[PDB]
Scaffold this active site. Structure first.
Site, PDB file in Angstrom:
ATOM      1  N   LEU A  13      -6.376  -6.154   9.688  1.00 57.40           N
ATOM      2  CA  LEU A  13      -6.191  -5.968   8.181  1.00 57.40           C
ATOM      3  C   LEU A  13      -4.585  -6.378   7.883  1.00 57.40           C
ATOM      4  O   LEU A  13      -3.697  -7.044   7.126  1.00 57.40           O
ATOM      5  CB  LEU A  13      -7.021  -5.831   6.727  1.00 57.40           C
ATOM      6  CG  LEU A  13      -8.537  -6.074   6.911  1.00 57.40           C
ATOM      7  CD1 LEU A  13      -8.973  -5.612   5.858  1.00 57.40           C
ATOM      8  CD2 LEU A  13      -8.765  -7.204   6.917  1.00 57.40           C
ATOM      9  N   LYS A  15      -0.762  -4.115   8.890  1.00 58.29           N
ATOM     10  CA  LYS A  15       0.322  -3.013   8.418  1.00 58.29           C
ATOM     11  C   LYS A  15       1.476  -2.799   7.548  1.00 58.29           C
ATOM     12  O   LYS A  15       2.371  -3.935   7.571  1.00 58.29           O
ATOM     13  CB  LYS A  15       1.192  -3.396  10.307  1.00 58.29           C
ATOM     14  CG  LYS A  15      -0.294  -3.244  11.683  1.00 58.29           C
ATOM     15  CD  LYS A  15       0.184  -3.602  12.702  1.00 58.29           C
ATOM     16  CE  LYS A  15       1.974  -3.656  12.599  1.00 58.29           C
ATOM     17  NZ  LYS A  15       2.028  -5.229  13.320  1.00 58.29           N
ATOM     18  N   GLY A  16       1.975  -1.369   7.928  1.00 53.37           N
ATOM     19  CA  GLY A  16       3.198  -1.143   6.490  1.00 53.37           C
ATOM     20  C   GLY A  16       3.649  -0.454   7.669  1.00 53.37           C
ATOM     21  O   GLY A  16       3.845  -0.235   9.097  1.00 53.37           O
ATOM     22  N   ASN A  17       4.870   0.324   7.469  1.00 55.66           N
ATOM     23  CA  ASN A  17       5.680   1.355   8.436  1.00 55.66           C
ATOM     24  C   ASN A  17       5.331   3.282   7.919  1.00 55.66           C
ATOM     25  O   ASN A  17       4.937   3.560   7.022  1.00 55.66           O
ATOM     26  CB  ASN A  17       6.645   1.454   7.881  1.00 55.66           C
ATOM     27  CG  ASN A  17       7.712   0.269   7.906  1.00 55.66           C
ATOM     28  OD1 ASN A  17       8.336  -0.301   6.708  1.00 55.66           O
ATOM     29  ND2 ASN A  17       7.515  -0.538   8.901  1.00 55.66           N
ATOM     30  N   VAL A  21      -3.723  -0.733   8.181  1.00 55.55           N
ATOM     31  CA  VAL A  21      -5.306  -0.510   7.417  1.00 55.55           C
ATOM     32  C   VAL A  21      -5.563  -1.678   8.096  1.00 55.55           C
ATOM     33  O   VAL A  21      -6.081  -2.786   8.748  1.00 55.55           O
ATOM     34  CB  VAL A  21      -5.255  -1.673   6.021  1.00 55.55           C
ATOM     35  CG1 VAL A  21      -6.541  -1.820   5.520  1.00 55.55           C
ATOM     36  CG2 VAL A  21      -4.721  -0.755   5.033  1.00 55.55           C
ATOM     37  N   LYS A  40      -7.044   3.068   6.283  1.00 52.64           N
ATOM     38  CA  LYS A  40      -6.360   3.108   6.751  1.00 52.64           C
ATOM     39  C   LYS A  40      -5.891   4.756   6.992  1.00 52.64           C
ATOM     40  O   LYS A  40      -6.773   5.839   6.871  1.00 52.64           O
ATOM     41  CB  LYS A  40      -5.496   3.537   4.740  1.00 52.64           C
ATOM     42  CG  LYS A  40      -3.558   3.451   4.975  1.00 52.64           C
ATOM     43  CD  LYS A  40      -3.035   3.831   3.960  1.00 52.64           C
ATOM     44  CE  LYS A  40      -1.566   3.784   3.920  1.00 52.64           C
ATOM     45  NZ  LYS A  40      -0.922   4.095   3.280  1.00 52.64           N
ATOM     46  N   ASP A 134       7.350   1.484  -4.098  1.00 55.85           N
ATOM     47  CA  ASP A 134       7.589   0.049  -2.991  1.00 55.85           C
ATOM     48  C   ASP A 134       6.669  -1.135  -3.729  1.00 55.85           C
ATOM     49  O   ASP A 134       5.746  -2.224  -3.265  1.00 55.85           O
ATOM     50  CB  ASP A 134       6.749   0.660  -1.768  1.00 55.85           C
ATOM     51  CG  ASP A 134       6.667  -0.198  -0.754  1.00 55.85           C
ATOM     52  OD1 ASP A 134       8.005  -1.330  -0.919  1.00 55.85           O
ATOM     53  OD2 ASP A 134       5.819   0.188   0.253  1.00 55.85           O
TER      54      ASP A 134
HETATM   55  N1  LIG Z   1      -1.597  -3.797   0.375  1.00 59.19           N
HETATM   56  C1  LIG Z   1      -1.165  -3.817   1.226  1.00 59.19           C
HETATM   57  C2  LIG Z   1       0.070  -4.206   2.218  1.00 59.19           C
HETATM   58  C3  LIG Z   1      -1.168  -3.768   3.338  1.00 59.19           C
HETATM   59  C4  LIG Z   1      -1.320  -1.785   3.361  1.00 59.19           C
HETATM   60  C5  LIG Z   1       0.499  -1.454   2.989  1.00 59.19           C
HETATM   61  C6  LIG Z   1      -0.052  -0.154   3.899  1.00 59.19           C
HETATM   62  C7  LIG Z   1      -0.736  -0.672   5.204  1.00 59.19           C
HETATM   63  C8  LIG Z   1      -1.468  -1.670   4.901  1.00 59.19           C
HETATM   64  N2  LIG Z   1      -2.561  -3.776   2.801  1.00 59.19           N
HETATM   65  C9  LIG Z   1      -3.272  -3.538   2.686  1.00 59.19           C
HETATM   66  C10 LIG Z   1      -4.189  -4.681   2.996  1.00 59.19           C
HETATM   67  C11 LIG Z   1      -5.874  -4.780   2.346  1.00 59.19           C
HETATM   68  N3  LIG Z   1      -6.481  -5.813   2.976  1.00 59.19           N
HETATM   69  C12 LIG Z   1      -7.901  -5.352   2.128  1.00 59.19           C
HETATM   70  N4  LIG Z   1      -8.654  -6.695   2.304  1.00 59.19           N
HETATM   71  C13 LIG Z   1      -8.054  -8.352   3.263  1.00 59.19           C
HETATM   72  C14 LIG Z   1      -9.170  -9.272   3.179  1.00 59.19           C
HETATM   73  C15 LIG Z   1      -9.192 -10.434   4.151  1.00 59.19           C
HETATM   74  C16 LIG Z   1      -7.668 -10.017   4.541  1.00 59.19           C
HETATM   75  C17 LIG Z   1      -7.051 -11.307   5.255  1.00 59.19           C
HETATM   76  C18 LIG Z   1      -7.089 -12.832   4.230  1.00 59.19           C
HETATM   77  C19 LIG Z   1      -7.070 -13.860   5.018  1.00 59.19           C
HETATM   78  N5  LIG Z   1      -8.061 -14.448   5.964  1.00 59.19           N
HETATM   79  C20 LIG Z   1      -7.093 -13.505   7.159  1.00 59.19           C
HETATM   80  C21 LIG Z   1      -7.074 -12.749   6.478  1.00 59.19           C
HETATM   81  C22 LIG Z   1      -6.148  -9.517   4.404  1.00 59.19           C
HETATM   82  C23 LIG Z   1      -6.516  -8.612   3.957  1.00 59.19           C
HETATM   83  N6  LIG Z   1      -8.084  -4.829   1.524  1.00 59.19           N
HETATM   84  C24 LIG Z   1      -7.316  -3.883   0.606  1.00 59.19           C
HETATM   85  N7  LIG Z   1      -8.333  -2.612   0.527  1.00 59.19           N
HETATM   86  C25 LIG Z   1      -7.156  -1.695   0.819  1.00 59.19           C
HETATM   87  C26 LIG Z   1      -6.132  -2.261   1.419  1.00 59.19           C
HETATM   88  C27 LIG Z   1      -6.310  -3.543   2.437  1.00 59.19           C
HETATM   89  C28 LIG Z   1      -4.111  -5.616   3.695  1.00 59.19           C
HETATM   90  N8  LIG Z   1      -2.549  -5.156   4.010  1.00 59.19           N
END
Ligand SMILES: N#CC[C@@H](C1CCCC1)n1cc(-c2nc(Nc3ccc(C4CCNCC4)cc3)nc3[nH]ccc23)cn1
Length: 289
Positions: A13, A15-17, A21, A40, A134
């Site tokens: 879903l 990536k950070g540094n 996730v 995570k 952040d």
């Molecule tokens: N904050 C923040 C930034 C980063 C974190 C920073 C450090 C590590 C990662 N990050 C956290 C999530 C994240 N995403 C989701 N849902 C979700 C659902 C769908 C989609 C897509 C959407 C459109 N269609 C195609 C797929 C993406 C995400 N749920 C979450 N719960 C807790 C975190 C989390 C995603 N990037």
């Protein structure tokens, strides 16, 4: 509380540094009725990074607020390496990509709703003496069209018992274009530096994430794309000291831009509190409605 045998990987879903996730399904009964969660993990399990991760988990476990992503539990294999943090899965992803996708149905009052929710989350953080460090739209998640949540806490620190700031210079790359001048110059992080970053978030929202208009693009055009490495930061500092600022985004009312410029005060003590930002934003919202 969660056992790794029952976590089934679906996709990545974000990536950070130092972290990533993944969307997974917790399915202990192995009948495809378990719930979808966000997991995570560290990408390189150093012990310094592992202690940072444990402190981040402790911080997130201690937060309960409508605009903060929900802690669900932890998961570890043999010994306690491979430590994983389980959170609620938010179905619309991050606010940055969401806003990029739907710019044609997100009007200014919806942006102000998001702004006010972010402010309530940040104020809640401040009452626990947490410094987020952040704040950016890429770190805001969307639960539905009417609710956003602060979503990552990997850089968050707790204020010392006796001081109003926290000094820290991590090795690695730093979001310098959301950083307050005192954080670039003295690595000082406070509630007021979070307010500076919040002004940059407001800018982001009102540009609708047009990438040529991102804070990096605008700052790098203002200082010249010549500059490499340390010089970038140096020129940024010098540009902020002569009151260089990001421009008013296209379509932004002057009241919103004035909120932004007030968050971008060089004097840390003259920046608004998050409660005052919530009040001003809510009155503009109520004027529009
Ligand atoms: N904050 C923040 C930034 C980063 C974190 C920073 C450090 C590590 C990662 N990050 C956290 C999530 C994240 N995403 C989701 N849902 C979700 C659902 C769908 C989609 C897509 C959407 C459109 N269609 C195609 C797929 C993406 C995400 N749920 C979450 N719960 C807790 C975190 C989390 C995603 N990037």
């Amino acid at each position: 509380q969660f056992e790794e045998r029952h976590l089934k990987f679906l996709q990545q879903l974000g990536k950070g540094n130092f972290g990533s996730v993944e969307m997974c399904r917790y399915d202990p009964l192995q009948d495809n009725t378990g719930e979808v969660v966000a997991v995570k993990k560290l990408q390189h399990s150093t012990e310094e990074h592992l202690r940072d991760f444990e402190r981040e988990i402790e911080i997130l476990k201690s937060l309960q607020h409508d605009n903060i992503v929900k802690y669900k539990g932890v998961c570890y294999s043999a010994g306690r390496r491979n430590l994983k943090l389980i959170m609620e899965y938010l179905p619309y992803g991050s606010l940055r990509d969401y806003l990029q996708k739907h710019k044609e149905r997100i009007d200014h009052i919806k942006l102000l709703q998001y702004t006010s929710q972010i402010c309530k989350g940040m104020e809640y953080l401040g009452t626990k003496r947490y410094i987020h460090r952040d704040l950016a739209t890429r770190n805001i998640l969307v639960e539905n069209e009417n609710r956003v949540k602060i979503g990552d806490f990997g850089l968050t620190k707790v204020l010392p018992q006796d001081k109003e700031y926290y000094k820290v210079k991590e090795p690695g790359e730093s979001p310098i274009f959301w950083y307050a001048p005192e954080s670039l110059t003295e690595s000082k992080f406070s509630v007021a530096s979070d307010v500076w970053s919040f002004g940059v978030v407001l800018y982001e929202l009102f540009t609708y994430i047009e990438k040529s208009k991102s804070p990096p693009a605008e700052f790098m055009r203002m200082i010249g794309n010549d500059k490499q490495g340390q010089m970038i930061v140096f020129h940024l500092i010098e540009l902020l000291k002569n009151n260089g600022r990001l421009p008013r985004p296209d379509g932004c009312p002057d009241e919103i831009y004035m909120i932004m410029t007030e968050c971008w005060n060089n004097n840390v003590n003259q920046r608004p509190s998050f409660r005052d930002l919530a009040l001003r934003v809510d009155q503009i919202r109520d004027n529009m409605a």
